[PDB]
């Protein structure tokens, strides 16, 4: 009973699938609640349209014998290319103002106790260099593969 | 666990020294008084505070280290009519009787004491010790607290120290019958346990079981309690915020500090609710006197009612929802300029607004 | 009416408690042995 | 007060040093009272001077609360002059 | 260090006064000899108690 | 013998159950009903009208109302209210050191009361000795014997809750003339004085008399020059509050919200509602609530000699009324210096766990009142360090009064403030800060906002 | 806003000055008079208007700066039956009640007065000075005005000027009493506010605001008013 919006939010995505629904606000609002409840996160209506498109194009999918690899895309109408997100970005940042700032020099804090550095080498020893590189990579192409679509 | 009729147990802190007046001769079936006496010590060293000179009543006077016999089920004890027995202190299950009742005095209540049948508990006008935990002290034995007794009854700093293989039950009567000597005192006294802090915990905590059995036998209530560690360190941590000089600031003091904003604004100081917490992991409710209510944790209660008003008293619906707790969320996050951090609570009310 | 002339009769006792305590555990005139 | 004391050990040489000044101070307060005598005192101070009295008393009372230190007719109502309680008589 | 293992109080509080009144005390000077008397007097406090603890030991 | 309708069991119920004085308005028949009622003249009542009024109260659902069919429910001292004795003591605390009982130890109030429990002590303790027998060794004082904390009787007066403690001055004094009510300890006891229908030798009397089902509250006639009356039914915090912010926008400088401290002890007739809004109890519970901006000009004036008054007399039904201000109007006896109470605005959220606390998103201001409680809070704010934005300031920003430091480290600190229309509170702040005067030491402040600030700033590992 | 009825406020433009003599001791439940007087002063430097020896009524007189105690609440705050008290232009809640009833007397009349059960008003005949914005003027210490005081009353062209942190409150009862020193010439006087605009806009609010509250509580209209700055552009 919980996540019935979310089951008819996918259950549409059986139909063309490439449209936009429409909810009120406190539609939305209950949607969004009920994911993050699921998930325990934060989250966002952006996360709620790319699970949309994502699904549809599962459900609309064949049945196959290999897994297909796909990418992110159909979130948020018009073609940008990188040019032009460079342009307006830039113009917006320009026009943008220094929240903050330190001057110039200054010294880079390095850390001095060796003890110290000693326990976090030991604290840190059991992690797998290979885990923790294969997860910090694929965080990074994951949200920016977000941002393109 | 079952306790056997003939055992008579008087309960008084006096008793961290020997009642050498109460002691009496017993008679047998034939109402034959025995002038033989057995008094029987949780230590060897204890014998040497017994005066075999003040039993004129006796005719030959006896003194052993009570040890638990295994042979014989505390259940039923051996028997021997030959003597009057008398234990002091006792902290292992006695295991024989004398003639007629067998006599038992103790600072110490414990279980196997507790179903005792005759209990006759002394009643002392409380006067509580000062907690003094900091590492011109004056180290005390506690085994042998009474061979300290003067300076005990005299100096006001004491670091109460013990032998490595001291047993546990020694530990807990030594620091009762110091704690009753300072409930003798005139002058409250401040000691230091130099004991693990763990192991003071467990110290204090069978110690506060024992004022139960205590209090459950009849002893009237003592205001000289004692606090767990935690609540030290969070007292601790509130004096330094305040800006209180731990040595300056008493505990009690600290905590009498809110008693003018029980009352008057019907609240639960904040400190009274932390120690509270911290007993019950090792709820409050108060009132005053013709008073109509009661303060407690969950606030205004009618007096002798449940903690809790009927669940249905109060509708909170129109607040008490998704729609209205996001609303007002994403309002002061926008006020504040906020991204996280956060949280926006519907407000239940008990009894009363 | 029957007052806690026990209780009463315990504190004045209680008083000086202690004092005779400390007798008990004074020193002594001489050593018989 | 060394400069007193080479007069002797006195036993309130403290007290006698804080009289010795006042009194040098009394002399002088009591030549501007007679140049003044004359003139006609108004019913509340001057405000100006009243404002400078008050800030330099800020001065002499923390420079004298930081120097901390250690027959009765004529001695006690000057003392209460030197104590500048007026209702000395 | 040694006036305070040797308990000499007058001694300790002479150092201390004179350099109070000794040096850029306040800047980095006070620091150091609040460190140095700090530690000192936590061992001291380490061995004392445990040190009293054995002269009343049976 | 004297009978009585059920129409005026409501009278019978509020002469017997409250301290009432205020007995003229009794209609004739109840007044001398009752009269023999309270005198104990029984033997001039009609028994089978006590059972009515019995099975009335029954009815009502009266809390802890223990009995049977038996007239010696009024005519001997027997168990009337039963509740069990649970206290979570805080051996901490100086409380009341009264006789110990153990929890779970079932209690009874009886309909007994003595001006000297002392003299009361021989009989008593004689049935109790009835009862028990042996040589149990027992903690008797001059107000009762307790066995095991367990078992027995003492004496206390007509109202305490067993669950608590007791601390603090009496805001009520009415010991003057109150007689101490008998309390039993025990189905023991319960069951015996219940079969047995003990009563103590006769010397109703000056030295003892019986009041069942005497609750004893502060009771009285409300006297009020009524400008105007409605009422209102619900369960909705928000709507309470809706009414306040509304009558103290309009003209009200001050309202005196009151909610009456027995609305929990029974489903109480319509009728006896009725009844009892002519009464009020010095006992029950006030507000002095105002609106935290006080508009400075005064178009905003209503009229200086009336007063508006919101009673909560039941559970669910509220009574606003329009009075004139007047002297003799009696109102329940609050603190002696008993804080005023102010109105929350949308403004700012009360911050969880303070009853003195708030902040203002827009302002980013922590604010936390010097005497003054909130009031109406229906949502609140969990704390959490971002709210203190530490303020930048290439020169430290200069601060003026009363300074406090919190955490040097962090550059906080609390600023006495008061608002315009005088309020006095303080502004916990973080940022580049400096004083112009001398910091002042936490201790300076009171214990309501120090509690408030070891609640606010103290991490609840 | 509350206020005990234990207090009562007498307005009148003459207390510009303090009224000793209708200072009187209070009496006790008792009915013992209290020959203790403490009176309260808007700041430190009134207190030199205040003579003690014009009270024979009392034995002991004691002046103080009356000062918000943020500690107690104005909706009750302490008594002190030890002695009588008196508050000359209170400009903070009144936290301290003396003996009998509190006695106050102001020029102003805040709303911290205005619900003040018992309210005395006394009454004047209007006189009003006249306003003289330009930038041979007479500076006034508004302040102390009492020390100009025969400035006030002697000369007409006046320069009120402020200390740079005086506060909002003292200004506006330092220009009251000024305007009540006005109402009593017989001749008009011409002053000039050395304030910003926006800053003698408000203040000429909050009289207004003043006047209208003692107006409700029943003062007789006065003709002498005040112009916003606009108006005076106009």
Request: charged share 20%; aromatic share 12%.
């Amino acid at each position: 009973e919980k996540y019935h919006s979310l089951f008819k939010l996918l259950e549409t995505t059986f139909d063309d699938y490439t449209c936009r629904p429409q909810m009120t606000q406190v539609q939305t609002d209950t949607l969004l609640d009920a994911v993050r409840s699921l998930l325990e996160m934060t989250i966002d209506l952006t996360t709620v349209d790319i699970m949309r498109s994502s699904f549809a194009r599962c459900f609309n999918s064949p049945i196959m014998r290999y897994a297909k690899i796909v990418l992110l895309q159909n979130v948020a109408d018009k073609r940008t290319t990188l040019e032009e997100l460079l342009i307006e970005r830039g113009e917006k940042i320009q026009m943008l103002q220094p929240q903050q700032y330190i001057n110039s020099g200054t010294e880079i804090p390095f850390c001095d106790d060796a003890e110290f550095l000693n326990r976090l080498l030991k604290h840190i020893d059991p992690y797998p260099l290979s885990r923790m590189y294969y997860n910090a990579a694929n965080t990074m192409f994951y949200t920016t593969m977000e941002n393109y679509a | 666990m079952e306790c056997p009729f003939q055992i008579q147990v008087c309960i008084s802190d006096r008793f961290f020294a020997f009642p050498h007046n109460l002691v009496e001769p017993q008679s047998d079936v034939g109402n034959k008084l025995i002038e033989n006496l057995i008094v029987y010590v949780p230590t060897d060293d204890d014998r040497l505070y017994i005066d075999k000179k003040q039993f004129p009543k006796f005719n030959s006077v006896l003194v052993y280290r009570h040890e638990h016999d295994v042979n014989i089920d505390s259940r039923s004890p051996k028997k021997t009519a030959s003597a009057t027995i008398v234990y002091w202190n006792p902290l292992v299950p006695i295991t024989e009787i004398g003639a007629g009742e067998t006599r038992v005095f103790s600072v110490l209540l414990t279980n196997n004491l507790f179903y005792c049948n005759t209990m006759i508990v002394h009643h002392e006008n409380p006067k509580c010790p000062i907690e003094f935990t900091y590492p011109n002290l004056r180290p005390i034995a506690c085994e042998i607290p009474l061979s300290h007794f003067k300076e005990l009854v005299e100096s006001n700093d004491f670091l109460l120290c013990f032998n490595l293989e001291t047993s546990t039950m020694v530990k807990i009567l030594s620091l009762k019958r110091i704690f009753c000597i300072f409930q003798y005192r005139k002058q409250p006294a401040r000691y230091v346990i130099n004991l693990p802090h763990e192991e003071i915990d467990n110290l204090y905590n069978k110690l506060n079981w024992e004022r139960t059995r205590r209090l459950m036998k009849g002893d009237v209530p003592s205001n000289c309690a004692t606090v767990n560690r935690s609540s030290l360190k969070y007292i601790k941590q509130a004096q330094s915020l305040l800006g209180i000089p731990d040595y300056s600031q008493t505990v009690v003091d600290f905590v009498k500090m809110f008693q003018k904003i029980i009352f008057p604004y019907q609240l639960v100081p904040n400190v009274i609710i932390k120690l509270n917490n911290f007993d019950q992991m090792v709820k409050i409710r108060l009132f005053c006197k013709n008073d109509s209510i009661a303060i407690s944790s969950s606030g205004i209660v009618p007096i002798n009612m449940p903690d809790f008003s009927p669940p249905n008293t109060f509708d909170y619906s129109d607040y008490a929802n998704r729609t209205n707790i996001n609303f007002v969320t994403q309002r002061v996050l926008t006020d504040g300029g906020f991204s996280s951090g956060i949280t926006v609570t519907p407000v239940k009310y008990n009894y009363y607004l | 009416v029957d007052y806690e002339k026990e209780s009463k009769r315990r504190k004045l006792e209680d008083e000086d408690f202690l004092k005779l305590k400390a007798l008990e555990f004074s020193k002594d005139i001489v050593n018989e042995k | 007060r060394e400069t007193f004391n080479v007069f002797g050990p006195f036993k309130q040489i403290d007290f006698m040093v804080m009289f010795v000044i006042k009194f040098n101070f009394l002399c002088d307060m009591r030549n501007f009272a007679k140049l003044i005598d004359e003139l006609v005192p108004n019913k509340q101070p001057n405000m100006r001077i009243h404002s400078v009295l008050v800030m330099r008393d800020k001065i002499v009372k923390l420079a004298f609360s930081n120097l901390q230190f250690q027959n009765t007719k004529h001695l006690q109502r000057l003392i209460m002059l030197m104590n500048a309680n007026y209702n000395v008589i | 260090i040694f006036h305070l293992i040797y308990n000499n109080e007058n001694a300790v509080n002479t150092i201390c006064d004179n350099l109070k009144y000794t040096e850029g005390f306040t800047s980095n000077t006070q620091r150091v000899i609040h460190s140095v008397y700090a530690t000192t007097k936590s061992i001291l406090d380490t061995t004392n108690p445990n040190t009293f603890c054995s002269r009343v030991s049976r | 013998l004297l009978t009585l309708e059920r129409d005026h069991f409501k009278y019978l119920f509020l002469t017997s159950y409250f301290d009432l004085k205020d007995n003229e308005h009794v209609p004739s028949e109840p007044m001398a009903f009752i009269r023999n009622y309270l005198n104990c003249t029984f033997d001039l009542l009609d028994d089978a009208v006590l059972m009515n009024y019995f099975n009335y109260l029954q009815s009502m659902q009266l809390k802890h109302l223990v009995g049977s069919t038996s007239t010696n429910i009024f005519k001997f001292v027997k168990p009337q209210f039963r509740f069990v004795c649970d206290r979570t003591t805080v051996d901490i605390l100086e409380f009341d050191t009264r006789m110990y009982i153990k929890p779970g130890t079932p209690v009874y109030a009886t309909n007994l009361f003595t001006s000297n429990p002392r003299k009361m002590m021989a009989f008593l303790y004689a049935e109790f000795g009835k009862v028990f027998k042996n040589k149990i060794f027992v903690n008797i004082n001059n107000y009762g014997c307790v066995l095991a904390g367990s078992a027995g009787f003492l004496f206390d007066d007509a109202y305490v809750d067993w669950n608590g403690v007791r601390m603090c001055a009496a805001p009520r004094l009415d010991n003057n003339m109150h007689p101490f009510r008998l309390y039993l300890l025990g189905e023991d006891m319960a069951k015996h004085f219940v079969d047995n229908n003990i009563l103590p030798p006769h010397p109703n009397n000056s030295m003892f008399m019986l009041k069942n089902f005497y609750k004893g509250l502060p009771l009285f006639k409300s006297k009020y020059t009524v400008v105007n009356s409605t009422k209102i039914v619900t369960r909705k915090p928000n709507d309470i509050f809706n009414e306040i912010d509304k009558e103290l926008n309009g003209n009200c400088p001050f309202i005196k919200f009151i909610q009456r401290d027995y609305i929990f002890d029974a489903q109480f007739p319509p009728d006896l509602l009725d009844l009892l809004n002519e009464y009020m109890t010095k006992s029950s519970i006030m507000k002095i609530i105002t609106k935290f901006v006080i508009e400075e000009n005064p178009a905003m004036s209503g009229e200086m000699s009336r007063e508006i008054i919101l009673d909560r007399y039941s559970v669910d039904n509220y009574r606003k009324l329009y009075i004139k201000m007047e002297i003799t109007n009696q109102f329940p006896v609050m603190y002696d210096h008993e804080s005023s109470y102010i109105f929350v605005s949308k403004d700012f959220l009360q911050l969880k766990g303070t009853m003195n606390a708030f902040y203002a998103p827009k302002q980013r201001i922590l604010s936390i009142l010097a005497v003054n409680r909130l009031f109406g809070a229906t949502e609140t704010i969990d704390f959490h360090p971002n709210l203190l934005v530490y303020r930048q300031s290439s020169p430290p920003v200069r601060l003026t009064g009363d300074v406090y430091v919190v955490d040097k480290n962090e550059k906080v600190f609390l600023v006495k403030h008061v608002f315009s229309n005088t309020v006095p509170a303080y502004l916990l702040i973080r940022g580049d800060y400096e004083s112009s005067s001398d910091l002042k030491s936490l201790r300076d402040l009171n214990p309501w906002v120090q509690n408030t600030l070891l609640k606010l700033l103290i991490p609840d590992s």
